[PDB]
Amino acid sequence: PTFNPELHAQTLNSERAYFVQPDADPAFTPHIGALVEMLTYARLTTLQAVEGLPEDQLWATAPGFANSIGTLLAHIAAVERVYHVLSFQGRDVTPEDDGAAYWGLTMGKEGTAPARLPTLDELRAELADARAETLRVFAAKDDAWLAEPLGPGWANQHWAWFHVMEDEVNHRGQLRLLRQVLA
Amino acid sequence: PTFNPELHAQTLNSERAYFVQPDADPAFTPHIGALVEMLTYARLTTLQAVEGLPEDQLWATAPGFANSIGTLLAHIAAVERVYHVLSFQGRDVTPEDDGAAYWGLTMGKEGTAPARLPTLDELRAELADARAETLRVFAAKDDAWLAEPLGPGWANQHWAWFHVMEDEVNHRGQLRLLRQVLA
Ligand code: NI
Ligand code: NI
Numbered sequence A, B: 001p002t003f004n005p006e007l008h009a010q011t012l013n014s015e016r017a018y019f020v021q022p023d024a025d026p027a028f029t030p031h032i033g034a035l036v037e038m039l040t041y042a043r044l045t046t047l048q049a050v051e052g053l054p055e056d057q058l059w060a061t062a063p064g065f066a067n068s069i070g071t072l073l074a075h076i077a078a079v080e081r082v083y084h085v086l087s088f089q090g091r092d093v094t095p096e097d098d099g100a101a102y103w104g105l106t107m108g109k110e111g112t113a114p115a116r117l118p119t120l121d122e123l124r125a126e127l128a129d130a131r132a133e134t135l136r137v138f139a140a141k142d143d144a145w146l147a148e149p150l151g152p153g154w155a156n157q158h159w160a161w162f163h164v165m166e167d168e169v170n171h172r173g174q175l176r177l178l179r180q181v182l183a
Helices: A030-050 A067-089 A100-105 A120-138 A156-183 B031-048 B070-087 B100-107 B120-138 B157-182
Strands: none
Touching: A030 A067, A030 A100, A030 A120, A030 A156, A030 B031, A067 A100, A067 A120, A067 A156, A100 A156, A100 B120, A156 B157, B031 B070, B031 B157, B070 B100, B070 B120, B070 B157
16 A cells, blocks of 8 residues: 555644554554654644745744745755655765755755745645655555664664654744744 | 663764664553654753753743743643643643643743742753653553543544654744844
8 A cells, every 4th residue: 555645634623633543554564654643743733834824924034033934844845855865765965966955954055056946835845745755665664674774874764754753843833933923 | 661761862962862762661662662762852852952051041032932941941841741631640731720730831821830930950850850750651551552542532642742742842943043042
């Protein structure tokens, strides 16, 4: 099996979003399944935080908030893209080889900037596309894989994917405050 | 067995902090073990965020930041205390029965305020004390328990403890920005 969205939370407006069910979906082994639930919840809460945002506020900053909502959304997707390289391809990321991801990763300070800045819809599409790739690969792996060190070292697979989730939540806390300042 | 701190990350300055090892500690069943690792990592990162903070900044606010660092640290501990009630005792929390926790939970707006505000050391002691109680109880439970609905309903045990971790990380993102504004 592959990821079936109907077996996971699709909205925060349901009791499903408040259950972590590691065996919900036969596409995933148990620890991987638990990660999928957590990643799903983190993404639903990121999207709720920016839902309805006036588009003229997307790149706005404020005192104490050096990174705009758009910058943070680019960053969240880019961290996932970076971990596809570290976790799935097994190599370190560089600005040479991974320029777009590196730009997102570094809040636009390094790497390769896009030709024009993305719209909010494009940012959400890139978030979804990154996540689709994660879930594709997760369906191919098992919990023994999750215990392995990363190819480039210094962490294990379980931590790496936890970190993708945790960093999203970290920046979503920031997004909540910035939106409130701007709006 | 009960929680042995030597079997878990004790510092962010070690490769141990970047491994999630659900079977590290015989005190815990696998999904519970994974939560413990995640909760541990979240707490280490909260403490790093406030380490060395000048104490005169503890209750300071700034434009866009209605909740001070002290308020957020009180909140993080209080959410854990609230979940001890919901998860372990099996009842809803009220301002009548859980006044101190309710004050932390609500950023000081409801509930029962302390006689005087805590110092940074006291805030960290309360964080540690709350966590000790969590780990005590986790050693008594198994993964079947983690799948159960909460007694007061609306979530499962697995989600509840995930949420304690995730909300900490959310507010730690806020703490990072506030400290940078003040300092
Ligand atoms: Ni980040
Ligand atoms: Ni909170």
